[model samples]
Target: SMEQVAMELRLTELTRLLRSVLDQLQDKDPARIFAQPVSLKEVPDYLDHIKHPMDFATMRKRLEAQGYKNLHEFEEDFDLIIDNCMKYNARDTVFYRAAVRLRDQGGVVLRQARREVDSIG
Candidate 1:
């Protein structure tokens, strides 16, 4: 019983870290480019280019479902959003530029969370 209780507490801490990172990313995306999936209706070629798309909404769903087992798992999906944007959009495009900015800021957020998660044990 005590062991399971401790595990729940650790999961709570992990959730906090994941949620905070999500909020930061969302806040950084005022253009809402990264907030949701690329509209296939608007850009039908999106999926053609981005084989593995990731968005904030999908991440939220994953989070609520407790799909991530650890900080690294969450980080992967977080990075995927930026990576996909950069890959699909051209260098001169606003989407690509925003992805660059997010990558820098997201890196810092992840690094800070990494140290915090390390202490959860």
Candidate 2:
């Protein structure tokens, strides 16, 4: 999988990402070991839950207004949404709204997301 990622993506940050994944996977390296308590990062939105502000193309400005200016910050919000969705059953949700805001905003790929987040760090 790392080889495939290394082959397909031709990038420095991406290669750094792959390397970071490898570092996390290894056990002998003390720094590579876990620090935080294990927990779920996010969960899926309820079916039929996506609505109203759920058009990424339409809600771009609101996202920036909400301080999600980059993919990494955006992903933090995204994961928070997923967490809330999984943890709640009511109208509380972030997927559709954020998705709608982000759908047409950028390259919008996994690589782009990682790149954005990595840059901020």
Candidate 3:
């Protein structure tokens, strides 16, 4: 009786286990905030909508009296919307560039927040 073990496949699973361990230790994935489908060809023209400098400090004021427990929850939602735009159009530069610039530069204020938002900026 004898046995031959390649050991490679088992080792690969071991590597995957280590990766999950690493995932827990590191900072939360911002990509998680950016999950959604997108198209590059659509919404390129309306990219101008997000050009305003939506300040973080100002939003806290609204959340203090609004439905949000506080700005922390509000900020998370805010950032998610920003991240959504980034993901939605991430395939190519057409609208992706607008999304990137929204996060990189600034975003539209809540006064102008949209429903069924396409370009989430």
Candidate 4:
């Protein structure tokens, strides 16, 4: 009985945490657009559009066009979406490829920053 009770409690706590995170993101413009279950196959296309984002003005205009009252909403829901998507969708080649791209991009940025720091000294 102790094991059963503990399991139930764990499930309840997990559910509550998920609900709270969802609530924070429910009002975000992009989050609202992405609230529906998306096929893993479609994630690459979505990410592609977000990755380039045209120019600064273009990005701002696009985000504004989404009509999200709160600009910071994406911060709340992005991780939640990733977690749920990972749990429900099987491993997608697109996801791994995109992750690699991100890692490579991060490495390049870090290298560039390091070079700038070296130059300063």
Leading candidate by TM-score: 1
lDDT of 1 by residue, 6-121 (tens): 88877877887788878987787788888888888999887778888899999999987767879889888988999998888889999999999888877887788788778765
Candidate 4 global lDDT: 0.39
lDDT of 3 by residue, 7-72 (tens): 444444433432332233222223332233222366564335444222223333443333343223
RMSD of each candidate relative to the true structure: 1.6, 14.9, 19.6, 16.6
Sorted by TM-score, highest first, which candidate order results? 1, 3, 4, 2
Query: What's the TM for model 4?
Result: 0.30
Question: Can you rank all candidates by lDDT, best first?
Answer: 1, 4, 3, 2
C-alpha TM-scores of all predictions: 0.89, 0.27, 0.31, 0.30
Candidate 1 colliding pairs: none
Give the local distance difference test score of model 1: 0.85
lDDT of 2 by residue, 14-120 (tens): 44443333233222223311222223344244333433212222223344343333345444533343344343433343433432333233223445547645674
lDDT of each: 0.85, 0.37, 0.39, 0.39
lDDT tens readout by residue for model 4, 1-121: 9998876665554444334433433433232333454433766564543322221222233343442223234222343344443443346655434333433443444344435434632
- Identify the runs in model 4 with alpha carbons over 4 angstroms from their true place: 38-121
Best by lDDT: 1
Clashing pairs in 3: none
**Candidate that beats the other on lDDT, 1 or 3, i.e. the better one:** 1
Backbone clash numbers for all candidates listed: 0, 3, 0, 0
